[PDB]
């Protein structure tokens, strides 16, 4: 993974994203979900999703949250007031602890002002808390401003590491992105049905056809302009649409 | 298991000198670091001194510095407080506590700090 | 670095009430302290670490608030065993101040 205090920044695009693989895969110990709830994430659509990757300790996962205090969301970490996506978290003890400790893992706890929402601060200056100036010496009231957990296997709980993914989806003002998923179900041929495909709804009896469409096309039309034809996606096979029987 | 043992004080004039004893038991000693904290009678608590694990790092409180040193033994499990140039007024308990999340001093931060196992007092009168 | 702190101190009250302590922090803003108790005759002991998150063997009756310069301990359900001291430490620097007590005592 990567540090708490240089977290990483990845930009999820255009894709199919099945938010469900984690929902329930109750691997996680920790799921919320704050402009949304979980289970209608597959249901919607952005324009990009990032997700920013850490580690931290286990009872620092209740700072990870819009309106939070402390030295990890202070300057470490910070999320916006009006958050949208969610933060997942799960204990890996085994992973990230090693005997004679792990010294590999930092966080900052001194800095000037606190962080602004997603802003993030890799510089290694020499801390001033004293008025007196430093001079890129250490010394009294002149601290280096970067701390490590020592991460031991004989940790109680609340002090092994935790890793932490927060993802954040956002809207800008494109023309669409990735979203949930589609579920496709069987083709029944012959019979009044109700039909939707992808977007076209109607009634009807569907048939296979022998037109041949073009190589781009979607469906057929006809004089006086009602969809006649449609062609499936799943398989790609014209497909006649004839109304029901009335009369 | 984890408890700490002392021994050391008693009564002496003022002006003199006394060291002390601050033992361990249970876990690994080196890895930590210690406290020294005392209270006189009837009054509140005071953080005196402090050493990283044997780094050489005490800073010191106000007055204590030039008449307190710190000596602990990763070997032995064992830490001394020796003070020299008594007041006739630092008579008190005193208590030594371990600690795992300070800054420039233990490498790595450790569960909880001033676990507290500690007794002991001293006795500075010309009685 | 000088910082101090502050305590409503030697307060009373009855069982299965509520108390409150308030230790206001000096200038320089902190991050979390603690909260100790001490039953006279004996050595202090641990209650809650930084802010919040009690230990183990507490009866869970406790809890504190930490939000930057001015922190509150808070018991709920008094109990007719739990009568002492509360020096609170705070953390963060070179010297480590204290608090200043707050003695308990019963209603008769």
């Known amino acids: 993974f990567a540090s708490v205090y240089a977290w990483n920044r990845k930009r999820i695009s255009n894709c199919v994203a099945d938010y469900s693989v984690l929902y329930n895969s109750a691997s996680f110990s920790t799921f919320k979900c704050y402009g949304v709830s979980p289970t209608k994430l597959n249901d919607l659509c952005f324009t990009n999703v990032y997700a920013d990757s850490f580690v931290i300790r286990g009872d620092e996962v209740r700072q990870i949250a819009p309106g939070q205090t402390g030295k990890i969301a202070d300057y470490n970490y910070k999320l916006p007031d009006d958050f949208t996506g969610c933060v997942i978290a799960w204990n890996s003890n085994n992973l990230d602890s090693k005997v004679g400790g792990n010294y590999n893992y930092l966080y900052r706890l001194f800095r000037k002002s606190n962080l602004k929402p997603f802003e993030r601060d890799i510089s290694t200056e020499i801390y001033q808390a004293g008025s007196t100036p430093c001079n890129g010496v250490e010394g009294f009231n002149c601290y280096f401003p970067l701390q490590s957990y020592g991460f031991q296997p004989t940790n109680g709980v609340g002090y092994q590491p935790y890793r932490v993914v927060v993802l954040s989806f956002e809207l800008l003002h494109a023309p669409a992105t990735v979203c949930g998923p589609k579920k496709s179900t069987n083709l029944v041929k012959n019979k009044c049905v109700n039909f939707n495909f992808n977007g076209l709804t109607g009634t009807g009896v569907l048939t296979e056809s022998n037109k041949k469409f073009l190589p781009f096309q979607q469906f057929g039309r006809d004089i006086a302009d009602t969809t006649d034809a449609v062609r499936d996606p799943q398989t790609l096979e014209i497909l006649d649409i004839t109304p029901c029987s009335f009369g | 298991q984890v408890q700490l043992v002392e021994s050391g004080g008693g009564v002496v004039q003022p002006g003199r000198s006394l060291r002390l004893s601050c033992a361990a038991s249970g876990f690994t000693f080196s890895s930590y670091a210690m406290h020294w904290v005392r209270q006189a009678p009837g009054k509140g608590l005071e953080w005196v001194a402090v050493i990283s694990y044997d780094g050489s790092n005490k800073y010191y409180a106000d007055s204590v510095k030039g008449r307190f040193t710190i000596s602990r033994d990763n070997s032995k499990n064992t830490l001394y407080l020796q003070m020299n140039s008594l007041r006739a007024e630092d008579t008190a308990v005193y208590y030594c506590?371990?600690?795992?999340?300070?800054?420039?001093?233990?490498?790595?931060?450790?569960?909880?700090?001033?676990?507290?196992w500690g007794q002991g007092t001293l006795v500075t009168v010309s009685s | 670095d000088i910082q101090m702190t502050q305590s409503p101190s030697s307060l009373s009250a009855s069982v299965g009430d509520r108390v409150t302590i308030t230790c206001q922090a000096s200038?320089?803003?902190?991050?979390?302290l603690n909260w100790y108790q001490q039953k006279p005759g004996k050595a202090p002991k641990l209650l809650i670490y930084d802010a919040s998150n009690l230990e183990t063997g507490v009866p869970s009756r406790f809890s504190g608030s930490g939000s930057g310069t001015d922190f509150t301990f808070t018991i709920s359900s008094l109990q007719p065993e739990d009568i002492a001291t509360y020096y609170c430490?705070?953390?963060?620097?070179?010297?480590?101040?204290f608090g200043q007590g707050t003695k308990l005592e019963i209603k008769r």
């Open positions: 430490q705070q953390y963060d620097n070179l010297p480590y101040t």
């Open positions: 200038q320089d803003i902190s991050n979390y």
């Open positions: 506590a371990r600690d795992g999340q300070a800054i420039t001093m233990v490498q790595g931060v450790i569960g909880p700090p001033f676990d507290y």
